[PDB]
Design a protein around this nucleic acid. Structure first.
Lengths: 84, 143, 60, 101, 99, 203, 128
RNA sequence: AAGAACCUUACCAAAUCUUGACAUCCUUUGACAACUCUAGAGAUAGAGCCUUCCCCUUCGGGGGACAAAGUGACAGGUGGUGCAUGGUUGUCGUCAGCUCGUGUCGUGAGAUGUUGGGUUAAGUCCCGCAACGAGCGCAACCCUUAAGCUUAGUUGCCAUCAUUAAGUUGGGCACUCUAAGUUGACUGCCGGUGACAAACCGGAGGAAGGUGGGGAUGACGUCAAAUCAUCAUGCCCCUUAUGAUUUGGGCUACACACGUGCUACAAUGGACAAUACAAAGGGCAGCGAAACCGCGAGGUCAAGCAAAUCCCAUAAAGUUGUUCUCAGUUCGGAUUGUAGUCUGCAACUCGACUACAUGAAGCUGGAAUCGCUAGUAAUCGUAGAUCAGCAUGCUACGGUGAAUACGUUC
């Protein structure tokens, strides 16, 4: 949990507040592990270093039980014989 | 190698009841075992108004065999069984035949059983018999 | 690897805890006290030297 | 069954081969819950072929062992030991009954 | 209402003989001494394994002695002050002066 | 089992501590501070063939004495090295230290001197069982009731390690009051590490 | 008055027994025993010194006990009393020591040691 | 591996690097840099900026130590060889046997002693015995505990006292208890027995009588046993890398089996409410006391404390009354998700813990197979290490408390 209240890496913040004014860019290489959601990180599209390389996503409205610490389950197919 | 005396039972000033408690005294919880047993006293001493020692000595003598056998390939021999092992025998067949009655309460099945063999009924008098059937069927090939 | 893990532990950190205290003499990281910073087997290795009390043995 | 082998990556033809040839012994009695095998390679410098195996039993276990040049001849030895083993273990036993008194 | 100290030795006689020679220093110029009151001498342990890699079950125990030894004296004169601070050896004690 | 040195056992009852100082939970500083002194005396272990040393510390100062076999060697002559060695320990100790050296007699009897003696001359390519035979031949000489003298490693600068030992006399171990000596050494010529084990019996 | 004394020790449970002649009436640390020890109705066996030595009785009871649970604590009662009656007069060692009552059976809980887990049993073995 | 989010973690990824991550030798020489700015994923660098010869200099040097560089060796290698090794350990197994010196007999290897009888926990002891003596080994020998006397009485105790809610106050050290020295149990002593002797049974006393309890201790050798990945090290190999810093993953995935253990399959039971008894350890900015907040987690301040003083703390099982009345149950709490607490910046892959609900199989387990000779088995809890966080584990402590041992057939 968090101790009242939410945090962020703040070196990504230095990026978003820079790209936040103009027609917002949608391309990011980043690290995105200790950075949780808030709606200034929008207008911008995130490809996070997954464990091996960076991996995009179109950010979208429904992102409430979700965050960018990882959204690619990294066990990489699967590790398992059967599927889900 | 000797056998772990009980001083007396301080109920009845007896001995046998403690020898039985220690078979009922699950978890070492004599408090609950002597609980359920004292309940057993008042209940059975109510039904067919009598004493424990009457239904107790009666029914403990009604299931208690005077023979049982043993193997030694395995040849099964008849022997007059020794008395203390015969005691714990009656105790053990008693209680182990008791709990399988499919009956809820701690005590009712017990008094049902000692009252059973009190009239020469019950499967512990029955096993006494089958012991005494194998025995004297066991005289031929082993005696 | 080992030789540079030795330098890994004693150089600085980012914050409090991503840091370990293994044994000085041997590089044994796991199962080691913080009292003396001495591993499982370094104390035995230097218990017999009997520098310290120490006892050794068998009363408890 | 349990097969760990150092300094080598196992293959599959050896599996069907060895374990089928072991399966031939259900003449007596198989009885096949566990069958632990064991290997290693070891410079001499002629330099090895370790062929070691357990073939445990009901109420008891066993050991057959061998070192070789090669796994085929070297294996025909983990078998043609266990054979003679299992055989005896069954002979045994003692029936020549005999009344008494 | 008198001097009181605490001695901690890891050999179980130096407490006694040191206690008594410093008592001699203490009653030389003084008197009214309470003795070496024993304290339980709590212990320690170290469950060490007889191995390097494995065989965790074959292990053994080093331990420790931590004795406390409580000694006093009443009715000071500055010469029994020196009886405290005149002789301290063998200094394996954890000597602590108080009142 | 298998076996283990009895100096682990006889200590805590009937022999010394290989160091001493008073008691408080800063063992950490005191301990490893001492351990490098115990290393730093390689300066003289290379130079005197000493047995060992066990310290005892003061309130604010340090008392020591190395149990040595080569007295005129450790002394210098006119104390030409004693005070600079005070400085050098003090320098690297980072604390004042009062040297007071102590010779050992009977002559080179105990585990240490004997052990690295035979190891070194063995590493002079010595027919060792004769050298061992000579050690015992001057050991029963000096007076002690049981010696036994083991060694291992790839002997002869050859193939696989085996280990010889020449026993002697009465040297009980399962006993508990013996006050005896034991060591292990390390010195190699060609193949690995060749180590010895010494055993004697006083009273 | 004159309170004889015996002192019993079982299972961490010391029994400073202040026996005195009189009626016979229990105070486990300023408290009767009957309510105290769970449950318990085994106090017949505790006046055993009166059961078999100078039988019946009685002498009055004060007692200062502490340590352990009731059982060994209810067993230092005996050695407290009987040792106090040998202290009263060893006349009846020939009916006490025929029941012992001075054998502080020193059995106890041994140390823990490898293999012992949540209840004391040797391990289970590997199989097949 | 006595605590895999990062770390540890080396494996994978990339940003980087190469006398390097890291040291010793030779130099310019210099006290080595605090805090910020730029960007960065950090590493870091541009940097600013302030590190700035401190010991002794008679003017120079010496010198702790430098700034990175130069300097060639170098450094390093979780890179391999436990079969090239040392050291250490499990093992049969705490099984009691294993050895020599002398002398003999033998053509000879060898045996003798070490065997025969009896006996013992056992090469224990004795009788006999071309044999006799020793070496290792067994027991004692060290620890800890039951019974005890003496020394020393707190932070420990009140036996006599009044006093306090209260051993708290004044008083006492009597008594438990307290840590050091003291005997006592040594077949010692008595009876019987026995080749009389060794020695067995019983008796007396005694707390302990039969190597008292338990631990410590593992003879010769076997497993080419485990270990280069504790540490060191023989040989080989890398060295713009198999060496290195930096961030992220991950070592934890599961169609599968196995092994390991923890937990229910309930009315001695389950749930409710009142109540008692333990031991042992730890504690400095660490043990957290009341009072306060809340469903709880937890947080407010801070009482007391390097400790027989203050805290962890409260004990649990038990017992007390109530009810439940045999169910897939008031059993079961897995599961899934909702909501809070604590940790570290950091709880997605990956910390538990707190209230809500959801309530699975499972109604005692086939064949198979394991431990245990009494405070045992069986059973309830406590605390120590590891520790920012984390134990169905381990370790230590206790409290409760059984059946069976005929006989060694097998």
């Amino acid at each position: 949990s968090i101790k009242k209240g939410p945090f962020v890496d703040e070196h990504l913040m230095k990026k978003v507040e820079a790209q936040e004014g103009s027609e917002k860019k949608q391309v990011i290489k980043t690290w995105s592990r200790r950075s949780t959601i808030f709606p200034n990180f929008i207008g911008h599209t995130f490809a996070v270093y997954d464990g091996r390389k960076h991996v995009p996503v179109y950010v979208t409205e429904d992102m409430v039980g979700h965050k960018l610490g990882e959204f690619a389950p990294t066990r990489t197919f699967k590790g398992h014989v059967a599927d889900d | 190698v000797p056998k772990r005396d009980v001083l007396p039972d301080p109920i009845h000033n007896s001995k046998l009841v403690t020898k039985l408690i220690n078979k009922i005294m699950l978890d070492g919880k004599r408090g609950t075992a002597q609980r359920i047993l004292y309940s057993a006293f008042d209940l059975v001493e109510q039904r067919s108004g009598r004493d424990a020692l009457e239904v107790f000595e009666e029914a403990i003598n009604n299931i208690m065999p005077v023979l049982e056998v043993k193997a030694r390939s395995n040849y099964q021999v008849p022997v007059e069984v020794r008395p203390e092992r015969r005691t714990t025998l009656g105790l053990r067949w008693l209680v182990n035949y008791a709990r399988l009655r499919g009956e809820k309460t701690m005590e009712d099945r017990l008094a049902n059983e000692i009252l059973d063999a009190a009239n020469n009924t019950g499967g512990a008098v029955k096993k006494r018999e089958d012991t005494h059937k194998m025995a004297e069927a066991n005289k031929a090939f082993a005696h | 690897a080992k030789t540079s893990m030795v330098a890994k532990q004693q150089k600085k950190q980012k914050y409090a805890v991503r840091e370990y205290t293994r044994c000085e003499r041997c590089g044994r990281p796991h199962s080691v006290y913080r009292k003396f910073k001495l591993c499982r087997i370094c104390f035995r290795e230097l218990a017999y030297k009997g520098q310290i009390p120490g006892v050794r043995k068998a009363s408890w | 069954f349990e097969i760990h082998g150092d300094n080598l990556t196992i293959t599959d033809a050896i599996r069907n081969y060895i374990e089928e040839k072991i399966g031939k012994l259900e003449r007596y009695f198989n009885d096949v819950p566990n069958a632990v095998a064991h290997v290693k390679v070891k410079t001499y410098s002629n330099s090895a072929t370790k062929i070691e195996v357990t073939i445990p039993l009901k109420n008891v276990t066993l050991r057959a062992e061998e070192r070789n040049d090669d796994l085929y001849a070297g294996i025909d030895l983990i078998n043609n030991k266990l054979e003679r083993q299992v055989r005896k273990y069954k002979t045994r036993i003692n029936r020549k009954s005999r009344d008494r008194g | 209402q008198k001097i009181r100290i605490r001695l901690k030795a890891y050999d179980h006689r130096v407490i006694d003989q040191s206690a008594e020679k410093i008592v001699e220093t203490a009653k030389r110029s003084g008197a009214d001494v309470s003795g070496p009151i024993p304290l339980p001498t709590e212990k320690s342990v170290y469950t060490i394994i007889r191995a390097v890699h494995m065989y965790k079950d074959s292990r053994e125990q080093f331990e420790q002695r931590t004795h406390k030894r409580l000694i006093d004296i009443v009715n000071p004169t500055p010469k029994t002050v020196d009886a405290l601070m005149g002789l301290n050896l063998p200094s394996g004690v954890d000597i602590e002066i108080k009142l | 089992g298998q076996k283990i040195n009895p100096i682990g056992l006889r200590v805590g009852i009937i022999r010394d501590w290989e160091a001493k100082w008073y008691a408080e939970k800063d063992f950490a500083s005191l301990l490893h501070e001492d351990l490098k002194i115990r290393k730093f005396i390689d300066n003289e272990l290379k130079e005197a063939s000493v047995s060992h040393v066990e310290i005892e510390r003061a309130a604010n100062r340090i008392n020591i004495a190395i149990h040595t076999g080569k007295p005129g060697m450790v002394i210098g002559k006119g104390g030409s090295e004693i005070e600079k060695l005070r400085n050098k320990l003090n320098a690297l100790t980072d604390k004042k230290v009062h040297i007071n050296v102590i010779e050992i007699k009977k002559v080179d009897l105990d585990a240490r001197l004997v052990a690295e003696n035979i190891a070194r001359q063995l590493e002079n390519r010595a027919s060792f069982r004769r050298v061992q035979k000579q050690a015992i031949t001057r050991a029963m000489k000096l007076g002690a009731k049981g010696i036994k003298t083991q060694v291992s490693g790839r002997l002869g600068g050859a193939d696989i390690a085996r280990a010889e030992q020449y026993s002697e006399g009465t040297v009980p171990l399962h006993t508990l009051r013996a006050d005896i000596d034991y060591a292990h050494a390390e010195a190699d010529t060609t193949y690995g590490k060749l180590g010895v084990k010494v055993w004697i019996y006083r009273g | 008055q004159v309170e004889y004394r015996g002192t019993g020790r079982r299972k961490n449970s010391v029994a400073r027994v202040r026996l005195v002649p009189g009626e016979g009436n229990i105070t486990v640390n300023n408290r009767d025993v009957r309510e105290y020890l769970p449950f318990e109705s085994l106090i017949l066996d505790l006046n055993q010194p009166f059961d078999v030595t100078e039988t019946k009785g009685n002498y009055d009871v004060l007692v200062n006990v502490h340590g352990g649970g009731f059982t060994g604590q209810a067993q230092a009662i005996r050695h407290g009393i009987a040792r106090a009656l040998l202290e009263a007069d060893p006349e009846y060692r020939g009916s006490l020591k025929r029941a012992g009552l001075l054998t502080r059976d020193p059995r106890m809980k041994e140390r823990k040691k490898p293999g012992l887990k949540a209840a004391r049993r040797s391990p289970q073995f590997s199989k097949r």
